[model samples]
Target: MVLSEGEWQLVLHVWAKVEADVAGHGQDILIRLFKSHPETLEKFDRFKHLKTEAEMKASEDLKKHGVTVLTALGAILKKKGHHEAELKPLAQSHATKHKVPIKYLEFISEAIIHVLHSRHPGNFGADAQGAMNKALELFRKDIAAKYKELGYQG
Candidate 1:
């Protein structure tokens, strides 16, 4: 599913602002993800030890990792449909090393969309949300395939 020119522009515009404050937006994204799907927290060694939301928020590693994840997402968005070149290695690494399931990547996309909506409030319209959905789905598809190639059943 190719994104229309307008959609591409929309994504870039929103992402630029999102990337500008990675600490805020990025941390919020992870917090939303972990809170919405607490089971996913077990996959992150740094976060697994945190038994409460306050503890998770207090962890320095968690914030640093969130920024790293958000920066990687910025790179993924910068390349658009050409993300396989960037995501494949990460998929293989997470699959083999961290034992992270491919589905978690898809869940992260949902968390990202939630962050965009929460950050921009009324400004983040349906069109921008739709664009992000398509772009993230494409990313998730390629990443999942790479995970499968690594012989990861998850």
Candidate 2:
């Protein structure tokens, strides 16, 4: 899952744009997740009863949590291989504390890919797609492994 230098730069460029408007773009990703897979809302205490996108958007905690996840993603993208050790711990914490399913992690990754593609408007060429997919595969693999290690049967 190695990214060519150009692909890495492309990802960084797009991520920089995302970082600049984390709250705005990040909220979109979360909204997509909740709307596409409404069951995921059950995992969050503040969002469990929220039934619509408008309701979710109005919740301050939703924006905060969205920003938090995007921030963590930015950190991971910035550091990449250099921060491999940190992924497992974060995955463990989410699995144990938040009870986030591995499927949700996959959904989030897909949501990110979708957002990247939509925001860039055909800018994510083959190389960029391959790189992003590979990077997300690594992330999901680690998260799933850690989730299992944490003794979560469901």
Estimated TM-score for each candidate: 0.93, 0.88
The 0-to-1 C-alpha lDDT of every candidate, in the order given, reads 0.83, 0.78
**lDDT tens digits, residue span 24-133, model 2:** 88899999887777777788887788877788889898899889888888888887645567687787678778887777888888888878788875667777777788
Q: Candidate 2 — number of clashing residue pairs?
A: 0
Distance from true location, Cα of 129 in model 1, Å: 0.3
Prediction-by-prediction clash tally: 0, 0
Candidate 1 achieves a global lDDT of 0.83
Q: Which residue runs does candidate 2 get wrong by more than 4 Å?
A: none
Model 2, CA-based lDDT: 0.78
Off by over 4 Å in 1: none
Q: Model 1 — TM-score against the truth?
A: 0.93
